[PDB]
Amino acid sequence: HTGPKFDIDMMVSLLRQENARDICVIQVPPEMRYTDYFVIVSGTSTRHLHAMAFYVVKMYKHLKCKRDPHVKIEGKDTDDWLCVDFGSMVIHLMLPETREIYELEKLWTLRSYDDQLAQIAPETVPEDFILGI
Amino acid sequence: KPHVNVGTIGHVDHGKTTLTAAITKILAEGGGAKFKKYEEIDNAPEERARGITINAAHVEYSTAARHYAHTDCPGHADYVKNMITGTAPLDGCILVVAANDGPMPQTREHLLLARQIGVEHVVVYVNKADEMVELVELEIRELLTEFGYKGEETPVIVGSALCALEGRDPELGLKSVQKLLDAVDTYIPVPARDLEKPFLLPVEAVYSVPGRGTVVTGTLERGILKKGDECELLGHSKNIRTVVTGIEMFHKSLERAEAGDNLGALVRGLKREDLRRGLVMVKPGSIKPHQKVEAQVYILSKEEGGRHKPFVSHFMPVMFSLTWDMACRIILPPEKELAMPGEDLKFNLILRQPMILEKGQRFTLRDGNRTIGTGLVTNTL
Amino acid sequence: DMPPLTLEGIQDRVLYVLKLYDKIDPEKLSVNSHFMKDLGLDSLDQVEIIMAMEDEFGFEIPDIDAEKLMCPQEIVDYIADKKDVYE
Amino acid sequence: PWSREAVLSLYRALLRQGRQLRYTDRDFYFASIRREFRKNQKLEDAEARERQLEKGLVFLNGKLGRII
Amino acid sequence: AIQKMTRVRVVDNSALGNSPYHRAPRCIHVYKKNGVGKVGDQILLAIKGQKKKALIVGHCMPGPRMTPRFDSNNVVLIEDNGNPVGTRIKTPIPTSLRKREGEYSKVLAIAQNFV
Amino acid sequence: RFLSPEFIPRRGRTDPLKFQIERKDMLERRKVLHIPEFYVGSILRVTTADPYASGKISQFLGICIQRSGRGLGATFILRNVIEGQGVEICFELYNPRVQEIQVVKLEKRLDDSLLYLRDALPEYSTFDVNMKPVVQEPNQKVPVNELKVKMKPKPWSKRWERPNFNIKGIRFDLCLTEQQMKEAQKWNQPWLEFDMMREYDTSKIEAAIWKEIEASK
Numbered sequence A: 001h002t003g004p005k006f007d008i009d010m011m012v013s014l015l016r017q018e019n020a021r022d023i024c025v026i027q028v029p030p031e032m033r034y035t036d037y038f039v040i041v042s043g044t045s046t047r048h049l050h051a052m053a054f055y056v057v058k059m060y061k062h063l064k065c066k067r068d069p070h071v072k073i074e075g076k077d078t079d080d081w082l083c084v085d086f087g088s089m090v091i092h093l094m095l096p097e098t099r100e101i102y103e104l105e106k107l108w109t110l111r112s113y114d115d116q117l118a119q120i121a122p123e124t125v126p127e128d129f130i131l132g133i
Numbered sequence B: 001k002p003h004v005n006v007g008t009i010g011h012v013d014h015g016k017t018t019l020t021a022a023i024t025k026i027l028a029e030g031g032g033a034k035f036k037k038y039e040e041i042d043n044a045p046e047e048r049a050r051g052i053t054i055n056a057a058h059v060e061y062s063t064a065a066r067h068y069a070h071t072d073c074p075g076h077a078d079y080v081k082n083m084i085t086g087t088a089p090l091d092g093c094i095l096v097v098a099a100n101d102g103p104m105p106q107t108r109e110h111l112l113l114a115r116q117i118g119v120e121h122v123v124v125y126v127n128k129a130d131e132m133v134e135l136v137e138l139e140i141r142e143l144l145t146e147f148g149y150k151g152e153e154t155p156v157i158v159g160s161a162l163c164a165l166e167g168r169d170p171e172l173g174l175k176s177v178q179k180l181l182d183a184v185d186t187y188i189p190v191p192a193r194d195l196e197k198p199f200l201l202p203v204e205a206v207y208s209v210p211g212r213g214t215v216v217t218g219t220l221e222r223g224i225l226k227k228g229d230e231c232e233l234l235g236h237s238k239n240i241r242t243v244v245t246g247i248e249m250f251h252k253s254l255e256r257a258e259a260g261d262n263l264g265a266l267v268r269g270l271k272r273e274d275l276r277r278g279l280v281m282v283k284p285g286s287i288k289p290h291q292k293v294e295a296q297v298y299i300l301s302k303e304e305g306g307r308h309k310p311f312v313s314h315f316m317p318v319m320f321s322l323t324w325d326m327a328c329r330i331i332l333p334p335e336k337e338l339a340m341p342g343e344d345l346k347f348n349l350i351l352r353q354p355m356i357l358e359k360g361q362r363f364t365l366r367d368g369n370r371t372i373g374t375g376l377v378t379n380t381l
Numbered sequence C: 001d002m003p004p005l006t007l008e009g010i011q012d013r014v015l016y017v018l019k020l021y022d023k024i025d026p027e028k029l030s031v032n033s034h035f036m037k038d039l040g041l042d043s044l045d046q047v048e049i050i051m052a053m054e055d056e057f058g059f060e061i062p063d064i065d066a067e068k069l070m071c072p073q074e075i076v077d078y079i080a081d082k083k084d085v086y087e
Numbered sequence D: 001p002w003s004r005e006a007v008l009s010l011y012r013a014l015l016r017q018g019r020q021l022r023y024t025d026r027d028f029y030f031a032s033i034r035r036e037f038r039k040n041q042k043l044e045d046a047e048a049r050e051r052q053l054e055k056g057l058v059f060l061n062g063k064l065g066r067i068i
Numbered sequence E: 001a002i003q004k005m006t007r008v009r010v011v012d013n014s015a016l017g018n019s020p021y022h023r024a025p026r027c028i029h030v031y032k033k034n035g036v037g038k039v040g041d042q043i044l045l046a047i048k049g050q051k052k053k054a055l056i057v058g059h060c061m062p063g064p065r066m067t068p069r070f071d072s073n074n075v076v077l078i079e080d081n082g083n084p085v086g087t088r089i090k091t092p093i094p095t096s097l098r099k100r101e102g103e104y105s106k107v108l109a110i111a112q113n114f115v
Numbered sequence F: 001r002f003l004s005p006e007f008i009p010r011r012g013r014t015d016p017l018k019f020q021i022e023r024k025d026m027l028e029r030r031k032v033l034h035i036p037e038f039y040v041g042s043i044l045r046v047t048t049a050d051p052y053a054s055g056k057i058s059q060f061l062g063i064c065i066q067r068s069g070r071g072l073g074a075t076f077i078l079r080n081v082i083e084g085q086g087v088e089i090c091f092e093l094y095n096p097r098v099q100e101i102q103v104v105k106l107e108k109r110l111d112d113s114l115l116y117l118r119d120a121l122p123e124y125s126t127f128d129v130n131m132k133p134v135v136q137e138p139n140q141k142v143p144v145n146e147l148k149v150k151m152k153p154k155p156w157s158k159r160w161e162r163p164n165f166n167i168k169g170i171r172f173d174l175c176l177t178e179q180q181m182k183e184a185q186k187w188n189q190p191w192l193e194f195d196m197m198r199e200y201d202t203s204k205i206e207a208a209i210w211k212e213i214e215a216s217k
């Protein structure tokens, strides 16, 4: 049981040996009440993504503390996007296609200041509440 | 106080753990180091790394002459895993033989793998002696000759492990452990440390800056990096001659590199397309890739999570060494039909492409996302 | 360590880094042609070039002057301030 | 932009941080910052240049999230 | 509680949700043993002459104490796969969505505000 | 003196011992976490531990709209419009999960409940998430906001115009008509002001609670 713990340095190196295409590991501050560390990794094919996700979870259980809760992989039915949540780490397995459309790194580095939030504007009801054509 | 690692080795019920308890017990009288209970040593703490679970008992005893670290294992299957993986490498070893049993073909494997761990200095102890004792002693010298040791200079000490632990025989039990203490202080008590060997760098990352060139990062284990050194990169049938320009540590320029440090090698006049992970950084003419390799691989038991069905020759697992991944083919040695789980034996495994494999290069064999074997290179053919 | 800062040797190492760059090729590259116009490089492109000079000689380039450095000849003159070459 | 200096300063400063990267793939980080500064720029109005610069400035700070 | 024939609000940057239309989106079906749907539950939508699956994210009916209570019925459009069609969630989502059983991680990933 | 609403018990057939038990438990918790004097109009920022995360800290700011419950389970509800979404959270006072309660702006409104703020215009419930606390001298009368609020169109969550709600903080003139007002008057119940056995005096009760509290400290 005793030895290596579950943390970024071990987890990333663990990913890299399965030919992780790109890795973005993001430190999340405590005010954003989600996780300590956000991770995005890309893949070559759909079956390659399953390979990685399933290795990571398998290795997790090996080094897992007894009281450390068990984890669930998400989106096995999905083609392009797979996600696994740990205690204080969150990982997203994607094609390059879905990276181009989600821009998860941009959202989490700069929150309210991203381009995607700028295009969309809040809709307000008119004064006296009368619509005109 | 110089500190080295030394570990017990031998057949089951040869009083290995009793000696381990005894050697710390006598030192407790003097108050040299912290001692553990015999029953405490019986229960080995669990160590988990690289998908391999091991019950290794570690006891720390400091003799007056030098500091020592000691390792104990409950089982033979536990013993082999420790030394093949080399989680805690041992400079010396103690071979323990029972008076009633002495040498046994099972104990042979213990000394046979000792050739592969690069240890050629051993200590023999005889226990359970409560002229027949002297009869078994001569075969041990002959046994060590077979492996490649010279049997004559090996120290063989008469005593009883239980006598030493209970302190009932000062002339037998006590005199034995002090003789063992003196024998280890005679044979390889001082550690071996040199950096004369050419440096090997498995490339962890390939990093390119325009107007700077490719930076390749790796952890040192042998050798020292210097600037302006003409160097060779080899791997995946790609061999190119180039020169080191800069070395990077803590994002600073440094002339000299040290083992156990992750250094960033700067190279010029090369393309990022050619330079990928899986490449190895060495001096030219030093080493060459070996396609066919002899190695002793421990096949994992069903208990840990190894596969239930034993494999036949021409089986194709996945070979993992350094930073490179490749699949291979295992041909089983003759007289054997299949290789059952929980049993370790030497193989001739053949890689798809010629890839570098040297002596003492630890590896794990895999099938997709599952581990079936861990092994160490015995010979390059 | 003291390297001999020969003006000719300075020129060689300056053109060495420019041929290392992807955008510009040695065919149209010359000692006297400037980056922005002649070699057809953007302002952001320039920033990377000066970084190449930054780590090579190991002396800091302030952002105030980095702007005016738009020519290889300007550079070989600028780095001549580091160690005065006459010849 | 707000200042022609400020944008070139920002492009410089960001790439300096890229050297200090530990876990994140450094080739991708550089590629991602390059293309951002390319396709967005060369075509903008005066008012939105105040916003896009600020977006980069909070990237520099990394207060809300820092890539490592 | 969002049941059959309930008007909902699509809180996404998705084109389908934010498109101007004569009908508000209606809850066709609730994927629960009993018809009532609380937060985290999946429901089927009739928008713009098509059926679409959606995740309930906050509602007007009071819940457990420290859990937030919204003033509109907010849903996020999702594919059958589980992939959200939209890219961003402007509106805050409750944090409770995390610990609940199912595929919530992706939606959390694209959300900005937690309340 | 100010006694927290929770301490004064409702009319019941509950034995006094049950209240004594609960009071002791409440008072212990008050020592650990300072409970500020706040009113229904006041603005509060509450910091809590977030169980859905690994002990990360959540703060929420909003205007109090109601304060209810008795004993340990006593509660209050905070309202606020976050970036174009109305949010209401009910908080337990004696929940161990809560880290800190601060009074950002201590004021009373005209009426004791503000649930009508849902039907009021959005801006009346929109409060800045990051605002500086504004403090007054200790021996000052608790300030009252005499704001009346403009409303949305007449379909409301409840019929506020009816005298049972007795809302004094709504600009009725703006939204309603005279005939609607006289229609609402049909539900007046004028005897109810003078019903003598309907009243609940807490004078002696509060006195005994004070005696317990001064003993505690």
Ligand SMILES: Nc1nc2c(ncn2[C@@H]2O[C@H](COP(=O)(O)OP(=O)(O)O)[C@@H](O)[C@H]2O)c(=O)[nH]1
Residues within 6 Å of the ligand: B011, B012, B013, B014, B015, B016, B017, B018, B074, B127, B128, B129, B130, B159, B160, B161, B162, B163
């Ligand atoms: N008579 C005698 N018995 C011994 C001695 N050392 C160990 N034993 C016996 O060996 C048994 C324990 O074996 P153990 O040391 O656990 O085996 P190992 O750990 O596999 O070497 C006990 O039942 C002891 O009686 C000895 O010096 N003399």
Ligand SMILES: *P(=O)(O)OCC(C)(C)[C@@H](O)C(=O)NCCC(=O)NCCS
Residues within 6 Å of the ligand: C042, C043, C044, D001, D004, D007, D008, D040, D041, D042, D043, D044, D049, D052, D053, D056
């Ligand atoms: P350089 O000479 O290629 O040009 C500098 C510039 C591209 C950074 C910029 O000043 C420019 O010419 N275009 C302004 C449009 C723009 O997006 N401004 C930068 C805001 S981040």
Ligand SMILES: [Mg+2]
Residues within 6 Å of the ligand: B016, B017, B072, B073, B074
């Ligand atoms: Mg033993």
Ligand SMILES: [Mg+2]
Residues within 6 Å of the ligand: F157
């Ligand atoms: Mg209603």
